[PDB]
Amino acid sequence: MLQPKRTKFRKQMTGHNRGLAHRGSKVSFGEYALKATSRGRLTARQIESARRALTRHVKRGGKIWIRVFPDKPVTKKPLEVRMGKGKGGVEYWVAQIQPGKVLYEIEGVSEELAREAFALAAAKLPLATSFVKRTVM
Amino acid sequence: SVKKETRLRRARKARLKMRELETVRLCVYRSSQHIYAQVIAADGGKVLASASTLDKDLREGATGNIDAAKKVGQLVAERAKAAGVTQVAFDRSGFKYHGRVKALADAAREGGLEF
Amino acid sequence: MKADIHPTYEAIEATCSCGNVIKTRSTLCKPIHLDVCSECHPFYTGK
Amino acid sequence: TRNGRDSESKRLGVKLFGGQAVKAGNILVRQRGTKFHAGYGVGLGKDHTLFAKVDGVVKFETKGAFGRKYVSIVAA
Amino acid sequence: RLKEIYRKEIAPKLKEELQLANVMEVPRVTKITLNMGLGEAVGDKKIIENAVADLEKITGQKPVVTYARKSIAGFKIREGWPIGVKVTLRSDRMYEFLDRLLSISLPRVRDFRGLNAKSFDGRGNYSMGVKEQIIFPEIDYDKIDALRGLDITLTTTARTDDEGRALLRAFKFPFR
Amino acid sequence: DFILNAQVRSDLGKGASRRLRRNAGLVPAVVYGGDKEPQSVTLELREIAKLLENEAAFSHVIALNVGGAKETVLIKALQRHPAKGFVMHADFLRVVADHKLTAHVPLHFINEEVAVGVKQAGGEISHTISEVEVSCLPKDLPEFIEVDMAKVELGQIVHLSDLKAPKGVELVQLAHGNDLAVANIHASRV
RNA sequence: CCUAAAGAGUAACGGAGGAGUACGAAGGUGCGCUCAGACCGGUCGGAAAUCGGUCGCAGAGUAUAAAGGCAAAAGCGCGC
RNA sequence: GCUUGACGAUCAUAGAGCGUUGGAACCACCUGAUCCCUUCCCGAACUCAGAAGUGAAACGACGCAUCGCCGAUGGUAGUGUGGGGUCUCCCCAUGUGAGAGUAGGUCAUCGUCAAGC
Ligand SMILES: [Mg+2]
Ligand SMILES: [Mg+2]
Ligand SMILES: [Mg+2]
Ligand SMILES: [Mg+2]
Ligand SMILES: [Mg+2]
Ligand SMILES: [Mg+2]
Ligand SMILES: [Mg+2]
Ligand SMILES: [Mg+2]
Ligand SMILES: [Mg+2]
Ligand SMILES: [Mg+2]
Ligand SMILES: [Mg+2]
Ligand SMILES: [Mg+2]
Ligand SMILES: [Mg+2]
Ligand SMILES: [Mg+2]
Ligand SMILES: [Mg+2]
Ligand SMILES: [Mg+2]
Ligand SMILES: [Mg+2]
Ligand SMILES: [Mg+2]
Ligand SMILES: [Mg+2]
Ligand SMILES: [Zn+2]
User: Which among A28, E111, F13, F104 is most buried, taking Cβ atoms within 10 Å?
Assistant: First the structure.
């Protein structure tokens, strides 16, 4: 479960998630990547659970990159608690995801073996995903 | 050099006050051989009157001591009058007001113009 | 140099037992007799 | 909750903009520190307030070294 | 004195030993500063004037006390506390001190075959160390407090330490 | 064959460009370089995308037929939709016989199965960069820089300075005092 | 200080910190000077004291929170 | 018309780095501390009296884009007004329009006065 070692502030506002990803949308390191097509946010329990499913399938050589870091704290107000009286305590960490963002990368394996490995990871994530290779530009 | 760049910073406070007030400025410059004096009009753009030990009546050889500055200081006062200037400010340009520059100023006071 | 805050500083003389005299102005106020100098030191000559 | 505090707002900012007619003694900019520096015909208060010493027009020019911003008064 | 010795023959010989072209670029020695860092006297304050009183005799010039630039409690000091004294010697005073150092006191300290020639910084300045002050004259052995470690520094207009060593090869420095 | 057909574009802006992609199936483009003013053109989407699956698309010179005129250009930059990936805008750099030009050239790794660090010590290859920035006259622009890793011991690092470029080709990054690693051999992950 | 939507203003048992003093010099003026830090050499201290040199330009400082300022330094020293 | 010095306009397209180069005059270094003045010590700095030396350093001039700094066109993001949708978000008509990146540029341009050439 990824989270920052320390933060300047404990809490954050909900904010909004708009636009597309013109930054972080290319295959920078590996040769095949899993891209995001819908927007949403990954909760650092899905990111871990999709990494376990991906490396277990290959389990022979290869290298794997994670390109998403969950660094936005979210809170929940405990049960049977009225409205108000402060802001709730931090529960888990999430990463904001925009269409076009690259999530995982891999190399050192076959082109086909990458497809079964990313299909196992894509089933644990709450958004639509796509498979892309690396182009010169 | 460090010596010259430190002095040019010593001269900034007085030169930036004479512009806020917008007054005529009498600027003195000293070197190891000669001493100079200028009258700067109102904002730095123009020079009205000037004198130094380089003119063809002080080229004699004792051009770098106290009594060489006295002749220059009272010489610019004569030339200042022809320009119809009076009530100027003195600008030591960062040099200490003690020696040659003080003799050049003290001649200008008796030379006719008032600070 | 300031005035009246430093020790008196004077020419004096120095003599070494090796038959050596060197002029050196200092603050002894009294000539002194030496025993070893650069003319007679072992590790200045090669011992 | 251990947070509910704030302070009254001080109403700082540019009072007269560029091209406007000023009278002597008018207050031009209210500041903390010197975000605008005093130019021609402009004085500085003891809390970094820019006021007018002459009459004319607000200028709002940036010039010189250090890349400062100057408020001055020019003839109307 | 050594001042005459320098400009009469040291300069012309050193001009050719380095293939120098201009007489202005020949290396020269500018100032000598000694100091002595008194880690003690934090709880005494009484040896400071003893340390001061010692150092006019050695140099013929009044020293001045230096204070702590910072607190740092590991050494149990506070900012603005007297930590050491220093002197600066220039022109004729340093030359006569230099003669008084080469052979009045240096040969007779206790020991040593010489001085190391690797004690040069990158810009041709040499600094050495003195364990016991009593190596100097005008401080007799029967009226002193605990022995204290004076320090010596040389500042030269030498661009690098190669010719700075050559200059200190003149003045006949005992280099090993 | 590296041929493109383009027509002169007169209507500019966001509203006019969004119409080209939506209705006509075209793509806006720019032709700058040489000593001439930039010219705005448009070209078919299915034709620019057909040229882009050649390996040496960006490392080879193209003859862009604009209307009835012809000229020699090279793909400089390329804009793509972040999610869908199709090309949205492309700009060409004109080619002059006496003028240096920079380009991105892919790397071919050869005889990997012959690598010493793999058969003997059981290592693994990891390409770090698959392209380089070059600077050469257009007469000797290479299609690909061939990097050889037959004689690479386990744990060896291959830098820019270790490979060979053709006649009159510079590696740019190497010239700027920064020779970043190309590939390596490392022990298996686990 | 943020919320606060690039003039001002703007709420919640919204998110974060401080105050209920200090100073006869820590005020005025004239004159003078630049920091933190890194590295090299140097007697005991030694990663870090005092010293010399090079680099650096504000990463220092500002009686006291944070924001906005600071070369005519608003920072540091001395005389009156 | 050129060189030097002083004062300004303008604050990197004007800066940094590298190389060459100037001493007849100016400038700097320079010689000395009697005298004016000075150092919480010291003629280092400040000051004074000068004329044997040297352009070594500093400074000025002339070169190079290596770093820095400027920087299009085109496209993209955002956005006021009116209208839509599958409405946590986007699309259409109209007006507006960056930031970053690319082609490329830059080793400045002026005014007054004084001595010379
Ligand atoms: Mg909310
Ligand atoms: Mg972004
Ligand atoms: Mg001042
Ligand atoms: Mg609150
Ligand atoms: Mg609060
Ligand atoms: Mg409020
Ligand atoms: Mg006031
Ligand atoms: Mg529109
Ligand atoms: Mg508003
Ligand atoms: Mg507001
Ligand atoms: Mg209300
Ligand atoms: Mg409280
Ligand atoms: Mg204060
Ligand atoms: Mg130090
Ligand atoms: Mg200043
Ligand atoms: Mg001198
Ligand atoms: Mg545009
Ligand atoms: Mg636009
Ligand atoms: Mg732009
Ligand atoms: Zn002897």
Answer: F104
